[PDB]
Amino acid sequence: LHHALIPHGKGGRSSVSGIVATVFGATGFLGRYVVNHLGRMGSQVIVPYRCEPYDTMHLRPMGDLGQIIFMEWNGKDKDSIRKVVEHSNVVINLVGREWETKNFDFEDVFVKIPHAIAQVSKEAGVEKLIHISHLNADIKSPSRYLRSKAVGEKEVRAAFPEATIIKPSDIFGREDRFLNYFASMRLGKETVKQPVYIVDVSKGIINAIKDPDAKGKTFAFVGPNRYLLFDLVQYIFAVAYRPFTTRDKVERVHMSDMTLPHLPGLEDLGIQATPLELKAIEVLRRHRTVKPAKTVN
């Protein structure tokens, strides 16, 4: 099994876990948590970055000496992808932009880039590939974001048969847009949301790395309880002690969260989902200058 990756040590910072992971788009909200979880157990991380190396500095102190290697890349060139995933045995894809750009539209971000990554990883001998798409991703969705997500999911499955598709649902956390977006407005009663904690998503990804039977499975990462939009916003504003993104985001938030009971979730990976009540105060303490919202199940 290519001895260099035989696990060693007690699973600490200076141990060896036998994981060589390439985390595409690791400079985002979820990428930092994924890279931190990978590096705290001694795994080697390859970070492909397209931004200024200054913006990636926060990832440096999350690994031991020589365990994090930063590499330049871009989605328009397959050679950079080939040289980035050449030696990795795990490839995690977190590339995704929530808005349009004159260089990268949703089709480029969510379809062509994941397809190229999956094809190059298959050609390079990578054994594990993890791809992340939205939970509500449907080919018939009104929004282009979810249609592209749906098309991308099919492409990865076609190119990488042994890929693992993970479908989180509106991740919330310290740097998430789900809570900060609603706390920065300073309409509902028919739409329900199922937020999921960021650490839970990162641990689910890590366990999917470790789990051997999760080769071709598809997961749906959802929270413990469902919230109507109105009372969830009420709770968000109450935590902050505050009295009560162009066109695609409003449509996307106005859609109701889907239900997929056939798809396995966090419990199948041995993770107990953390309710929003425990971490809402931690997230929203910085928006300042208790009666939790009712749930529907």
Binding site: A4, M71, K83, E86, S88, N89
Partner: protein, 96 residues
């Protein structure tokens, strides 16, 4: 005499070179592998063998106090040539 690995890297004078399957090779991408071009074994193998007419010869590496500790080498064996322990220079009696 720097060789090249079958993968493509240069082999160090100690013979170290990552094989095809080693993941640690990724540390050299977009960078370089530090290798010393001058090999001590090749440089010392091309030194001429000194011809002295004494049974026992003294070597201090040249320079006196700037060399190695002074040692004495016996040259009775006519099959091979006496080699200094530190410096690696060779000495030989005048056969024939």
């Amino acid at each position: 005499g720097v060789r090249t690995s079958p993968t493509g890297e240069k082999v160090t004078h100690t013979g170290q070179a990552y094989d095809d399957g080693d993941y640690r090779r990724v540390r050299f991408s977009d960078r370089q592998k530090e290798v010393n071009e001058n090999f001590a074994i090749d440089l010392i193998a091309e030194q001429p063998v000194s011809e002295v007419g004494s049974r026992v010869i003294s070597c201090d590496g040249g320079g006196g106090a700037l060399g190695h500790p002074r040692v004495y080498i016996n040259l009775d064996k006519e099959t091979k040539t006496g080699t200094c322990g530190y410096c690696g220079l060779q000495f030989r009696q005048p056969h024939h």
